[PDB]
Structure 1
Amino acid sequence: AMVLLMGVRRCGKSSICKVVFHNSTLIDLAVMELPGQLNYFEPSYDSERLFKSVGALVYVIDSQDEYINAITNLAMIIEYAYKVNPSINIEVLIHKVDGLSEDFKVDAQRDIMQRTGEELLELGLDGVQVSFYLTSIFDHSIYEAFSRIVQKLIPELSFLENMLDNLIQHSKIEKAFLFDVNSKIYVSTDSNPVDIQMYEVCSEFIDVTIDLFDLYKAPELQNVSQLANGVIIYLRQMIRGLALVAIIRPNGTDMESCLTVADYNIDIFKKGLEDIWANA
């Protein structure tokens, strides 16, 4: 599942790649940037194997600059991308939206959606669905957008959802995330809505864990962080680069008993995750 990053020059693809992936199917592989300038596309210039090897195509649109020509070039790209392979998920990111109001952001997203839909109607493409995400480097939005893009390329999503739901239901967990060690891209969660504040807490917990481990090296990552109100934050490294982060509430119980039952349940969950080849 190799995703391809496409966009105009100075839209922010390299900065996005650096911020996300520098700080296979599921691991954060070396993605491919592609500077696409305005030109006439050559018909079948040995690009069929390239687009057939892309799990999902990601397009970047700069909201600061004019984007009508960007949407036109995007439509030209989709015009052969959907023709070569009709199973490619197409994603569009509206980057650099940090200095915009909520109403302006929603209006811009609606205008971009309407323009893309009308241009695809003009080109005669049918049965194609394009997702849109409002992304920015300075906040959590790019992480959530890449999380959705990665989640669209894991065929075992619902089974992981059921497994995490059962784990949370039998361990008094508030919210459990199945992160990855790099890029902080959470892979699976429960049916509960992804709270932004809790996601940022878990991401900074991942950063603190990795940094503190890297400070003392050269002699399986586990971490328990308990707050003042009894709320604990748990960490346990899963198979390959996956890591499990959960927020467990005590509900007026013993701390050590809760830690023991959570450790046993999470070890059982890891043993179950060993059978499924969701890693790497």
Structure 2
Amino acid sequence: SKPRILLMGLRRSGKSSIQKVVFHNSSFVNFQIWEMIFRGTGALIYVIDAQDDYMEALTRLHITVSKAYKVNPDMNFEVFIHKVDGLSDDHKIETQRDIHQRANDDLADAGLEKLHLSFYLTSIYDHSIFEAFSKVVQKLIPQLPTLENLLNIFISNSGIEKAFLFDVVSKIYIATDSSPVDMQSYELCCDMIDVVIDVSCIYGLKEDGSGSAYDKESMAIIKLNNTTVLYLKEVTKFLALVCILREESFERKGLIDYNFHCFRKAIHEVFEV
């Protein structure tokens, strides 16, 4: 059931820089750069260079998207207004409103105003591209309300403030409990996964050449001087739970651990793993 994403744009839009930063078989998500292909595809991400002039790029956008609505009119169209790290907010906003306006204005005159275009301000020196991908992938998971109800029963009953379900390779969150998501918590959790994976690549690969950094027993506890605790546990070979809680809730670590195994078996049954 792996969600299918295609990524498209002109030479120098930033694509393989985006593919590199996010993914470097081994994701929860099936991802590819570019009327056959668009037949079984969830989402098409059109990347525009925002540091460059976009008039050329807006044109190709309208062609490739009208092309693919024809084939599969359920496909999600996602637009990455990209390399915005090169501009001032004044310039970010005006481009956003400008690409928004013309991309949508161009779609009225093809009589295709029943074709939704979501927008994202992305950058590779930024987490925006993770946030952006996390949003795109979440729309392609039909069992998202089940994952979100399971995290809710898990964190309620476990004294946990916030829980993200992560794709370990990409640092994309496929689900979170119902609490509002502060994007700084999301970034911090992504930076934890990097720390866990890069220390696991160096130590704990097996006496011989190699093995795998992430495995059934992959666990981390990070303690922050404001008594915040971050707690990562393997769920599946793709997916890791990361929890944010306080030291005080973490005193009841036995109850969290026992309940975690109910949540984990429940996640397995959802994915028929």
1:147-193 CA distance string (max 9 Å, x none): 11111111011111111122221212121111111011111112222
Q: Give ranges in structure 2 of 5+ residues lacking alignment.
A: 208-215
Q: How far, CA to CA, are the matches of 1:268 and 1:156 in structure 2?
A: 18
1:216-264 CA distance string (max 9 Å, x none): 221621122223333211110112310110011144x6x4x42111111
- Within a 5 Å distance, the mapping from 1:35-46 to structure 2 comes to none
Q: How far, CA to CA, are the matches of 2:81 and 2:161 in structure 1?
A: 32
Q: How far, CA to CA, are the matches of 2:78 and 2:117 in structure 1?
A: 6
Alignment partner, residue 234 of structure 1: 231
Alignment partner, residue 33 of structure 1: 33
Count of residue correspondences:
261
Q: How far, CA to CA, are the matches of 1:78 and 1:99 in structure 2?
A: 27
**For 2:144, which of 153, 157, 160 is the aligned residue?**
157
- Superposed CA RMSD in Å reads 1.9
Shift of 1:194: 2.0
TM-score computed with the length of structure 2 as normaliser: 0.90
Alignment partner, residue 14 of structure 1: 16
Does residue 224 (structure 1) correspond to residue 221 (structure 2)? The answer is yes
Does residue 268 (structure 1) correspond to residue 262 (structure 2)? The answer is yes
1:51-88 CA distance string (max 9 Å, x none): 11322111000101111221121111122211111111
Q: SS of the residue aligned with 2:118?
A: strand
Q: How far, CA to CA, are the matches of 1:190 and 1:92 in structure 2?
A: 27
- Judge conservation of contact 1:172–1:250 (CA < 8 Å) in 2: no
Q: How far, CA to CA, are the matches of 1:152 and 1:278 in structure 2?
A: 20
- Judge conservation of contact 1:156–1:278 (CA < 8 Å) in 2: no
Shift of 1:123: 1.0
Alignment partner, residue 246 of structure 1: 243
- Judge conservation of contact 2:62–2:107 (CA < 8 Å) in 1: yes
Q: How far, CA to CA, are the matches of 2:101 and 2:72 in structure 1?
A: 24
Paired residue type of 1:18: K
**Sequence identity (%):** 50
Q: How far, CA to CA, are the matches of 2:112 and 2:198 in structure 1?
A: 48
Q: Give ranges in structure 1 of 5+ residues lacking alignment.
A: 35-47
TM-score computed with the length of structure 1 as normaliser: 0.88
| Runs of 4+ more than 6 Å apart | none
- Judge conservation of contact 2:51–2:86 (CA < 8 Å) in 1: no
Does residue 112 (structure 1) correspond to residue 109 (structure 2)? The answer is no
1:32-51 CA distance string (max 9 Å, x none): 222xxxxxxxxxxxxx2211
